């Protein structure tokens, strides 16, 4: 709809800009306030560093994608500079925030409580047909109560039949991405699966790199072998095993997300 009509559209005078939590080349975000009361997140688009339409249409798709599990977005100013304002998480991405005392003091049974958090939401995105293609832990936000949700949907895609394929010259990181994405370009949900897997290993290791002491191109030999990344230090190994159904070679063998939920929750009633 247009401007005058939409429903996120909001005046840049309703905002106020307190702390930047982040710049970079496409631009910053920052903590600020909505109608004076309201903390919210604004991203903010560097004039000419990248298409304003691309900018703007993660802010659209995440019209179509709301959900507790799922940062929520909140308006947007389609005026340069361009801004997109979202919920707020007080406790930033979750490699950060495991990193901190707080973090570091973690239970394994909250780590799987999180990490069912993460699964619910990307069962809500597989449900919609949706895919995220970003999924890790810095794309993951931390809440005030300790709660998690899904962030950073610029990857992310409405897949309209199985699969969606992208640029030959796309490059995304290589340890996160499934091998049918690295080789070729062919994203689905399983993909994203392919991803918590990893993102599981950055839970149980409070932010660690994946595949430690390895390169791209050793961890792409390597999983042509068959092999998958080695036990983190103190993973339970059922949750080790689980990782393990997430890295399955055929992607239609790897599980849902629901019954990744399903499955976490268990881990963590009786943890
Ligand atoms: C301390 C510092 C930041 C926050 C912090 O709180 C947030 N709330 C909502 N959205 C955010 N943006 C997510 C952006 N993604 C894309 C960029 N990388 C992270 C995820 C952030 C950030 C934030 C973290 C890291 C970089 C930019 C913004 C909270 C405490």
Do not use: K, S
């Given at each position: 709809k247009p401007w005058w009509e939409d429903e996120w559209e909001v005046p840049r005078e309703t905002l106020k800009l307190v702390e930047r939590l982040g710049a970079g080349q496409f631009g910053e975000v920052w903590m600020g306030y909505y109608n004076g009361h309201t903390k919210v997140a604004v991203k903010s688009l560097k004039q000419g560093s990248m298409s304003p339409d691309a900018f703007l249409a993660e802010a659209n798709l995440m019209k179509q994608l709301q959900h507790q599990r799922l940062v929520r977005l909140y308006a947007?100013?389609?005026?340069?500079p361009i801004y997109i304002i979202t919920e707020y998480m007080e406790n930033g991405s979750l490699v950060d925030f495991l990193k901190t005392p707080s973090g570091i003091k973690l239970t394994i049974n909250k780590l799987l409580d999180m990490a069912a958090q993460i699964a619910e939401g990307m069962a809500f995105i597989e449900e919609r047909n949706?895919?995220?293609?970003?999924?890790r832990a810095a794309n993951i936000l931390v809440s005030d109560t300790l709660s998690c949700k899904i962030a950073d949907?610029?990857?992310a895609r409405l897949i309209e039949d199985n699969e969606y394929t992208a640029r030959e010259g796309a490059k995304f990181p290589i340890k996160w991405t499934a091998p049918e994405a690295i080789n070729y370009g062919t994203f689905t949900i399983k993909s994203d699966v392919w991803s918590f897997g990893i993102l599981l290993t950055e839970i149980v290791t409070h932010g660690r790199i994946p595949?430690?002491?390895?390169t791209n191109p050793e961890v792409i030999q390597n999983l042509e072998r068959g092999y998958r990344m080695?036990?983190?230090?103190?993973?339970?190994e059922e949750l080790y095993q689980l990782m393990r159904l997430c890295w399955k070679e055929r992607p239609e063998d790897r599980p849902t997300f629901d019954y990744l939920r399903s499955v976490l929750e268990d881990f963590f009633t009786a943890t």
């Open positions: 947007v100013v389609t005026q340069e949706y895919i995220h293609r970003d999924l949907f610029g990857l595949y430690p002491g390895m080695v036990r983190p230090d103190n993973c339970p």
